[PDB]
Amino acid sequence: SGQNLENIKKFIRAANYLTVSQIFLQDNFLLERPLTFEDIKPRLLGHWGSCPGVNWVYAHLLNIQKQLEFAKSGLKAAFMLGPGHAFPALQANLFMEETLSKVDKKATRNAQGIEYISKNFSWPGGFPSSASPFTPGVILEGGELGYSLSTAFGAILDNPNLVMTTLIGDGEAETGSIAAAWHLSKLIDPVKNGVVLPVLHLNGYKISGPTIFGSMSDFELIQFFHGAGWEPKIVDEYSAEDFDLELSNAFSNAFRDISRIKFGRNSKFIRLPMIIMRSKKGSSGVKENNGQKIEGNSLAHQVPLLKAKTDKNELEKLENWMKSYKFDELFDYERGEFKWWINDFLPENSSRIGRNRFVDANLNFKELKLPEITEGFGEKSLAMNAVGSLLEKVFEKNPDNFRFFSPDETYSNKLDAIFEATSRSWQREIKPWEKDLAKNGRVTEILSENCLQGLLQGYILTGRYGVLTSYEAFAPVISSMMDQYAKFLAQSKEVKWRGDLASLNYILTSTGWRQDHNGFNHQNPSFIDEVLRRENGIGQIFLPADDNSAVAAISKMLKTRNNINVLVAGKTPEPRYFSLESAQKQLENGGIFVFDSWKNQKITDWDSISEDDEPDLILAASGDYVFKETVAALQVLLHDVAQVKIRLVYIQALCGKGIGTFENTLSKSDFVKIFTKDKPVIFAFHGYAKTLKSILFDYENPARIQINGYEEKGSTTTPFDMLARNKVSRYDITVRALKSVSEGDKVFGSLVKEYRKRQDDALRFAQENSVDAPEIENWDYLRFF
Amino acid sequence: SGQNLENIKKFIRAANYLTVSQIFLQDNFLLERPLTFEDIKPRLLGHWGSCPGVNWVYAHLLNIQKQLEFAKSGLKAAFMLGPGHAFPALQANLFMEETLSKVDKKATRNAQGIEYISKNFSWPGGFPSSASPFTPGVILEGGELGYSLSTAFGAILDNPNLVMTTLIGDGEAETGSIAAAWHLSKLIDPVKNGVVLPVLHLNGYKISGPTIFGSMSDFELIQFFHGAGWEPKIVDEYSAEDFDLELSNAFSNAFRDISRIKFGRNSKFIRLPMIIMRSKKGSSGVKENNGQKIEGNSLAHQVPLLKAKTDKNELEKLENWMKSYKFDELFDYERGEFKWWINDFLPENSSRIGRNRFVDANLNFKELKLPEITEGFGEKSLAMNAVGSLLEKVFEKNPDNFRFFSPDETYSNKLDAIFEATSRSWQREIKPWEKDLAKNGRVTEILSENCLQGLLQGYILTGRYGVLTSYEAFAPVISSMMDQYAKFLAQSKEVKWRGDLASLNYILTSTGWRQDHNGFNHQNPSFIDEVLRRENGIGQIFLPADDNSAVAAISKMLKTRNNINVLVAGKTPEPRYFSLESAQKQLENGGIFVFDSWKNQKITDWDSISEDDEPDLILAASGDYVFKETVAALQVLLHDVAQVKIRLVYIQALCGKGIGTFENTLSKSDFVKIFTKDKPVIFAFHGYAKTLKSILFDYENPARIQINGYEEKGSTTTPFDMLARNKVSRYDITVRALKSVSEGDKVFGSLVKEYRKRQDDALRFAQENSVDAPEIENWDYLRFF
Ligand SMILES: CC(=O)c1sc(CCOP(=O)(O)OP(=O)(O)O)c(C)[n+]1Cc1cnc(C)nc1N
Ligand SMILES: CC(=O)c1sc(CCOP(=O)(O)OP(=O)(O)O)c(C)[n+]1Cc1cnc(C)nc1N
């Protein structure tokens, strides 16, 4: 114990020394000669206040892992860093562990490695100032605060004997996501999945002020964290005779309780332990400077000596601070290597914190077994039921690497068929009249969308599969956090040892065009714009036409890696236009369907399109309801005049690089063939008009393309009134097509008046009877298969 | 007591009867004859499960208001409905009291009014199914759950006699916004302000399953809500008499409130009480149907009898359910009015819940006094310091209707000058080394952005002013909720009795181009895209060029009403420009600056632009950090080649309707004069390129416009490296301009080679020295002063 404690103290001292050397020094890293003004970095970037807590937690975790390995237990520990601004200290904890030496050859544990890791911190072309995928064993960026407990819970599923210790700052704990994630222990069974160990760094200060949790006493914190499903233990630096002994006792007790919980079963609810660690912010640093308080104050957040390159007293303070660590007793200056204590302290390579096998995606990724797609049919299209049946088959075929997440909307979205295979995860009591609740359920349901997104991202980044479904309007709640994930993917594109990962799959349904029980608060198609905004080859939206297109698309997204895909489709009975082979060929051609109505010819290959024979007008649609309105308008236009030639175009997929998919994106020359250079193009969009305008900016002649979308209007009314309020009903589409072609009002005016009268009569019937007119409800639509 | 109890019971019986009549009946509202199949609505829309709790709370609130007015107390109570899907029951509570009759003449409290409110619920053209601005006394729609506590805390400020009772659902309490807002009592003093009263519905069930909070026992709930700084009380429907217990709870809660608000004896932290009530979901309704459980189960969420128009047993169940409420003992069928008992229950006029004076925007809105604008002094311009000084003057001049909100970032954003007027609100202990903390501070700081947005919207919707500042990267966290606010404004455009409101003002600074201490996670310019997507005349972005432009813009947004404005500017020492507080203010009438470099001529009136002489190319920028690069590129181009003519265009404001402001938006004819029809336009943007592409879709000839902006690339490096990574540096701009102008690549090949070599040398110097080259650091710019 005493030799053990001495080894932890030496490890902490060395980690602190390399942290300060990373922050300040650019030369004379070993301090063999007195410090001058030429051995200081020109710009003193970085942070210091949270580093000592990171060092203490990492060293105690290494000691605990060594003890567990001696006990011959199967538990493997991993570390998660919430405060991503404390990156350099963690870097030091890797350098003396030799994890970084397995990735970079220049980071060997010697004097050259010390110089390499000290000079290149925050340097242009060196290591970044924050956590990144370039760091081994890192899955959470920590830049945007929060999203730390949910990702830790998501990485623990289906990975027993894995203990993930995550560090959460007290200022970060004031966010909504962290506050909501405390209840995630009521839905996950730790015996068959694993244990998450939370440590709260209660330094007491934010960037420039005290914290909410730092103001609370010990009694209030105990009651708050025991009101949820946690068992908290508090250790404070201000009153402890020996801080490291208390930290060792707390970690040993927590891991003993974890081992006791794993070995055995209990027919009740579990209470995972957690550690609150209170310490002075920026401990073991400069105490005072220019009469102000640094240690134990919010002024230690950034660097505490901003003028060390020009002020003599600041340089003396920095030199004394670095010499307080006594690096001569740990390092060996003669040979340039560490002494014999570091080999005694560290365990073997297979059982170290930074090289956990359960967290790595290279040792856990497997292919997904796709069942045969059965394109069953009835009388009307029900895309959500078919998607649920296919996901039920997927759940049957892959019983270890597939999961489902939803914010209590599985029945409302017509995806309940998946309950024929698996139940919903629930660790609390079940009443006899309740159904679909089990401890080992593979569906997790909670109203906090942030927790669901964190669980999905943790499960995917560990190396497995998942799909998250939701309403379309409530998606942007997890908008910004999703963008963070995208950055990770971009930062994984330049790393040669990361490996492949499953795609991030969203199923957004119950769109605003058919919200019957709610009005104007459940219609917000802005999530797809945020998905399409990113430009690092990430972002795909799938726009099915019927149930066959829906099952083809949901089969396509499960075969894609390292991307983000969103599928938006309705859940109401709908007409059917395409069979299985036509839908599959359309998806393999990008997702564009072209039809000529004056000759009744479907075109699925862009070759053999006649230049001598071109359409007079183009009607294009994107989305199921707008496609129904477009085909109804095309039917009316074929009935009435039939002298002009109309080409019908439907788009099934959109990507950040243009029209179609990333693998097969429509080019600038095929757009000219599909869409004629000068003919008008009336376009109906499921979402905002500017979302399509941004994509169509880069294509040929954007002046003639009229685009109509949601336009942010509507209330609780009939579906036809909802379509007519935003000028995307069939009659206004026909009016626009008549006015866009030839003179318009000169010859086709009376038809415009007749169509407006028909729309007025339909709206009057809907207003008077609260149901749609029988002319629209019993409409006879077109067929293509 | 007993007379009051039976009057309350009669009120709740009437409320339940009108709620069911609103949900189901189309005719025979008084049930004079036996119910048939022709008196049922064709579509049964609405919700029922949460309505009885709303009715109980409203009746007890009215009783407690009458009892308060008996003793001549100044406290005025208001009601807030979190579960917005429970709208019809609240409507019933607005019918027996004559609040709805003051707005609508047809809603008079008689038989015709009963028919009017029952027939038109969820009808096309009638009352909506959810809460809306059309309802008097409503400031929160309740569509997106979780924004109820923070809005109440925002609306409760500077109103010492307003007590707001808000209803929160147990499923809604699982959202992170509510869990973050539970701690808001530690920053707002309830003696000089009002008291927010939270009530937890706790019916036990979500849409399709149990709730997390419903699974917790009483002991766990007591600990969780005591640890957060509240005084919870529990009443359950499984008791002898629910109404007597509820009345005792409300009476004791009001006694504590009056004993704490007017004595002022306590100087330490306070403990606001809250009410936790437990009841069966959909109480006093259908018990069983088709062998399933309805009352006390999640199946009572929507309509519990979905086939009452076709099934005889369902119709009989509905008739028995409605006849369970004996409406004959509360109504006179021949007179058509209520009996005398209601006149003994309702309090005096204007002492009623639905007509609170402290909540209405009318009778509380006052114009803001703008101090005189002053110019900036010095070579380098600091926009944030000038903005802070102007806000300090505003705080001085308006000591009762202005407040500031920030997520612990006002020191880092160079806005600390406002600390010369007011401190930060803080109700906890203050250390001797801590500064800018006071109980009566007018600045609220917490890391939860959702709480800040809720406080700002609550303050603004009651008829006062406020400004919220933040980083640009973490703004999208509050994107979607902001969209909800915009919808409110749109509905307020169609309500004739709703008064004016102050604009929603954002200041986002520390942009991604100058994140020195942070890396990739702190660059995300997507919030302005979310704001610009509103299409109801809402959404304005202000893009200052220097400090004078910043103060002119911040003076302009404080003079705008019923809108949303965003101001984005840097905080680094930047060169000054045309802005001398006079030319800048003249530019603000249009928001666009035009300069001709071949004759050194500024243009402020667009009708003076000569059509005979035209620029050879246009360099345009939007944002200060890239305006620097484009004026440097203009300087280099003027130095090297003089036979070409360059027109410099800067844009200061963008709106959803086009270029400029809503009051003065650039037309499609002025765009042709400013931007020539066929000349190339090299445009450089502060944010994403597609955000500007969507706006420029609607203008003339968008094919020739080369838009470059942030490309999601960068790391911890020098500012010039950050500019060059996204191809928006000065050398990139001049290379692009040379490529655009030149007919062939062999005329300016030496120049582009030289500029590429110069950029390579600058990047090499930055890589080797970690400091920008002296050629760039000591650059000499031009001025239009
Ligand atoms: C650099 C950065 O992004 C930091 S660090 C920091 C204070 C962290 O509080 P904490 O007490 O948990 O940290 P610690 O004392 O060092 O442990 C803030 C508010 N920010 C900016 C910020 C703002 N808001 C959000 C959601 N995320 C971030 N990162
Ligand atoms: C219709 C709608 O938008 C409702 S109602 C409702 C149940 C609310 O649970 P709670 O028990 O707290 O309310 P109560 O049953 O009425 O008492 C949900 C989940 N939703 C959809 C939904 C989903 N997610 C979010 C953030 N908001 C909403 N409104």
Side-chain angles (χ1 to χ4, degrees), chain B residues 395-434:
Chain B
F395 260 103
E396 281 173 11
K397 261 193 157 285
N398 300 274
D400 220 21
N401 51 319
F402 198 83
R403 272 189 189 265
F404 199 76
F405 307 97
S406 192
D408 201 74
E409 272 151 60
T410 179
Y411 281 111
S412 324
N413 290 142
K414 298 198 171 86
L415 291 158
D416 36 358
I418 83 153
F419 285 128
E420 270 128 40
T422 179
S423 292
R424 293 176 306 199
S425 41
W426 185 262
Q427 313 298 318
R428 289 294 198 149
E429 216 39 66
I430 300 165
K431 295 301 187 187
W433 56 89
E434 295 167 356

Side-chain angles (χ1 to χ4, degrees), chain A residues 23-76:
Chain A
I23 287 171
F24 285 106
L25 291 209
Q26 84 173 21
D27 200 348
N28 199 48
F29 312 99
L30 289 163
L31 288 193
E32 272 144 339
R33 52 171 179 83
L35 194 33
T36 67
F37 279 150
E38 285 292 327
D39 312 319
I40 315 292
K41 271 166 190 161
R43 293 191 274 136
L44 304 188
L45 321 159
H47 301 72
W48 159 251
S50 37
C51 299
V54 177
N55 294 336
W56 302 328
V57 167
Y58 214 108
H60 280 82
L61 263 196
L62 281 157
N63 186 61
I64 275 302
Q65 173 87 97
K66 175 97 164 186
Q67 274 259 26
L68 282 190
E69 139 183 289
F70 179 75
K72 275 303 169 76
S73 306
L75 293 169
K76 299 294 199 194

Side-chain angles (χ1 to χ4, degrees), chain B residues 446-460:
Chain B
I446 209 171
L447 237 156
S448 180
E449 289 88 356
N450 299 306
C451 292
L452 272 36
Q453 173 73 27
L455 285 161
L456 184 68
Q457 85 193 0
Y459 209 64
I460 285 189

Side-chain angles (χ1 to χ4, degrees), chain A residues 42-47 123-124 129-130 141 143-144 171 174 176 179-180 186 205-212 215-216 220 223-224 226-227 293 296-297 302 408 411-412 424 426 428 433-434 446-448 474 476-477 480 484 487 516-521 523-524 526 529-530 532-533 535-536 688 690 693-694 696-698 702 705 710 712-713 716-718 766-771, chain B residues 42-47 123-124 129-130 141 143-144 171 174 176 179-180 183 186-187 205-212 215-216 220 223-224 226-227 293 296-297 302 408 411-412 424 426 428 433-434 446-448 474 476-477 480 483-484 487 516-518 520-521 523 526 529-530 532-536 688 690 693-694 696-698 702 710 712 716-718 766-771:
Chain A
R43 293 191 274 136
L44 304 188
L45 321 159
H47 301 72
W123 207 271
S129 38
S130 52
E141 298 275 74
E144 192 165 303
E174 291 162 11
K186 297 176 168 87
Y205 291 87
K206 289 138 72 178
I207 292 185
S208 58
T211 71
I212 291 283
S215 75
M216 322 180 22
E220 283 158 84
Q223 260 174 204
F224 181 80
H226 197 251
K293 201 189 181 83
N297 190 47
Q302 285 202 341
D408 203 72
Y411 294 100
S412 323
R424 285 179 310 196
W426 185 263
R428 309 300 292 226
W433 56 88
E434 327 200 19
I446 192 180
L447 242 182
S448 175
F474 303 148
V477 181
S480 76
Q484 286 277 285
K487 288 177 177 295
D516 294 328
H517 291 242
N518 317 288
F520 206 59
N521 279 281
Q523 24 201 129
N524 198 18
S526 82
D529 200 299
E530 195 96 302
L532 286 165
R533 211 97 46 73
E535 286 298 319
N536 281 315
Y688 296 115
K690 33 183 59 180
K693 280 171 186 183
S694 86
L696 289 185
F697 194 93
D698 306 303
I705 303 182
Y710 165 53
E712 262 274 4
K713 281 175 178 67
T716 314
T717 181
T718 74
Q767 251 152 18
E768 289 159 3
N769 296 273
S770 176
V771 287
Chain B
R43 294 191 275 131
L44 304 188
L45 318 159
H47 302 72
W123 207 269
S129 33
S130 52
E141 322 103 294
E144 260 191 42
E174 293 163 5
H183 289 292
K186 295 176 173 86
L187 308 182
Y205 291 92
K206 285 183 269 197
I207 292 189
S208 304
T211 66
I212 284 161
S215 76
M216 323 179 23
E220 283 163 275
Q223 257 185 51
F224 182 80
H226 195 292
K293 201 189 182 84
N297 190 47
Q302 294 220 135
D408 201 74
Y411 281 111
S412 324
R424 293 176 306 199
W426 185 262
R428 289 294 198 149
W433 56 89
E434 295 167 356
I446 209 171
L447 237 156
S448 180
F474 308 124
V477 179
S480 77
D483 264 318
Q484 289 275 285
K487 283 169 175 293
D516 299 326
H517 288 242
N518 306 302
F520 204 46
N521 305 111
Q523 303 147 83
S526 67
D529 208 319
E530 187 105 338
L532 273 168
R533 275 204 299 280
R534 300 291 317 197
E535 284 298 321
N536 279 316
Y688 295 116
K690 34 182 58 187
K693 280 163 185 262
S694 85
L696 289 185
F697 194 94
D698 305 304
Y710 180 60
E712 269 279 351
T716 315
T717 182
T718 73
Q767 251 152 20
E768 290 162 358
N769 294 277
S770 178
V771 138

